[PDB]
Design a protein around this ligand. Structure first.
Ligand SMILES: [N][C]([C][C][C][N]C([N])=[N+])C(=O)O=P([O])([O])O[C][C]1O[C](N2[C]=NC3=C2N=[C]N=C3[N])[C]([O])[C]1[O]
Length: 482
């Protein structure tokens, strides 16, 4: 049964046309309205030349428009490329050129974020009368499952990011497994938290819309105060939270310090993205108990959002008193999460090795990085029609079947919840004329450098320099000269 992600959505619209699909603090859309609007934009896009394998930039803010935008790109047959408005011009323009994007879905407020852009631009906030003249009907046969759905950039240790190419087929697999794992229903109300720069936004968006649940888009202001984040979730009657682990750690700390009650509607908290602190897990069970359910999800971007999860609420007392909390078991039978030795053989239970992913979860590869692709996406010697992705994560399967994350073999870290290659920051710092050698380490970020010429305002100079090349979370808050 060949299916694209938008087809899955379109099936749901047919079942529940009048259900509310998306709610923001400023307005809402029914499944019908969302679908009709995404179709009008997709038709327009098709006339701009968007077709299977066409990459389309999306530089939008979190809004009803953003959701129409994504789905319209998908419906037209194109793959979107998130272009985070908070990133600096130079980074965004590099992405646009690397991806060869000639169609950009954006808004007027993001004018002039790309340098020297000669492609087609659509501004969803000011061109809606035009888009409304296009057909409201579903498009047919614009893609096959092996065509791209999105290309999402991640940090690159050689000094520029690179695009992880995701096909409809793996995203559709993921989405259908996750709906069944989380038990999402038409009664759920799921908070959309993370930027579309993070593949987890796809979990939040497509899990919700392809099951008939309501997607509630957050604001910037609601996250900066945990009290506010909780109260707004109560007011909205949110049933499902999807939180970056570093955020949930903050939330656990404040829940207990301030004895805040959780929203009465909340049934499920999904965390992931970095190593969960066992001490805060213990504190959650002590103060909150087994409801809402708490799930730890693991996966790299290259494995399409998540490959394994662990229901923490279902662990025993002693499974939770280890020094590591598990990342659990595969999301489904067509996804393999192996712990392999240095020759790609499985190992006895409780033996540590490197995590390799196989099966349906795999990305196609990295966009325009054939060396890097060959190095990470490897033909399986024991199964030559298939590939494995080399995660760079160490782990071991415990005797109970649960996987444990045991850290990294390399210099990728998570800072403030974001995937960062230290090498990327090193490489860029080395470009600066006053830097001769440089090493950056965690932990937060600390840059160590041998100057050509020292200067007492070098810290502020180097942060200025980085600010116009890297996202803010890659900017070290401290420098050391040797
Ligand atoms: N994809 C994502 C994840 C997801 C989860 N959550 C949900 N699903 N809800 C991510 O994160 O991706 P990236 O950015 O690529 O990165 C990856 C990395 O990180 C880490 N992790 C994840 N998750 C986790 C971790 N650790 C620990 N624990 C957990 N849970 C690793 O390193 C990977 O590779």
């Amino acid at each position: 049964f060949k299916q694209s992600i938008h087809q899955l959505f379109e099936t749901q619209v047919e079942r529940t046309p009048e259900a509310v699909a998306v709610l923001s603090e400023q307005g809402q859309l029914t499944y019908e309205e969302l679908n009709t609007k995404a179709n009008q934009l997709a038709h327009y896009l098709r006339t701009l030349g968007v077709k299977s394998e066409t990459l389309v930039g999306v530089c939008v803010d979190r809004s009803l428009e953003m959701v129409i935008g994504l789905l319209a790109i998908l419906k037209a047959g194109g793959a979107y490329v998130p272009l985070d408005p908070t990133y600096p011009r130079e980074r965004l323009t590099y992405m646009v050129q690397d991806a060869q994007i000639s169609v950009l879905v954006t808004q007027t407020q993001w004018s002039n974020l790309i340098s020297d852009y000669q492609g087609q631009v659509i501004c969803l906030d000011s061109q809606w009368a035009k888009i409304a003249s296009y057909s409201q009907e579903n498009l047919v046969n614009t893609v096959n499952p092996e065509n791209l759905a999105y290309v999402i950039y991640t940090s690159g240790s050689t000094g520029k990011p690179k695009g992880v190419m995701i096909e409809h087929q793996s995203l559709v697999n993921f989405t259908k497994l996750a709906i069944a794992q989380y038990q999402i229903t038409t009664s759920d109300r799921t908070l959309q938290f993370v930027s579309i720069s993070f593949d987890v936004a796809a979990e939040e968006i497509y899990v919700t819309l392809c099951s008939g649940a309501t997607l509630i888009l957050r604001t910037e202001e609601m996250i900066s105060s945990i009290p506010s984040f909780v109260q707004k979730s109560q007011d909205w009657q949110i049933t499902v939270w999807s939180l970056p682990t570093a955020y949930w750690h903050l939330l656990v700390n404040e829940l207990v310090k301030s004895k805040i009650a959780l929203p009465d509607s909340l049934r499920l908290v999904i965390i992931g993205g970095e190593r969960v602190q066992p001490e805060l897990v213990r504190m959650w069970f002590k103060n909150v108990g087994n409801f809402p359910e708490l799930i730890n999800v693991y996966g790299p971007t290259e494995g399409t959002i998540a490959v394994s999860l662990c229901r923490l609420s279902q662990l025993t007392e002693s499974q939770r008193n280890r020094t590591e909390i598990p990342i659990g078991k595969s999301l489904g039978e067509n996804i393999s999460v192996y712990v392999l030795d240095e020759t790609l053989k499985t190992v006895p239970p409780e033996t540590p090795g490197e995590i390799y992913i196989g099966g349906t979860a795999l990305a196609r590869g990295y966009l325009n990085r054939p060396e890097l692709t060959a190095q990470k996406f490897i033909q399986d010697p024991f199964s030559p029609s298939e590939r494995l992705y080399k995660t760079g994560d160490l782990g071991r399967y415990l005797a109970d079947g649960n996987l444990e994350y045991l850290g990294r073999v390399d210099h990728q870290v998570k800072i403030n919840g974001f995937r960062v290659e230290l090498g990327e920051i090193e490489t860029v710092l080395l470009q600066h004329h006053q830097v001769a050698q440089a090493v950056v380490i965690d932990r937060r970020l600390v840059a160590y450098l041998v100057p050509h010429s020292t200067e007492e305002n070098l810290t502020v100079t180097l942060q200025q320099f980085l600010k116009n090349k890297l996202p803010s979370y890659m900017i070290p808050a401290t420098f050391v000269v040797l």
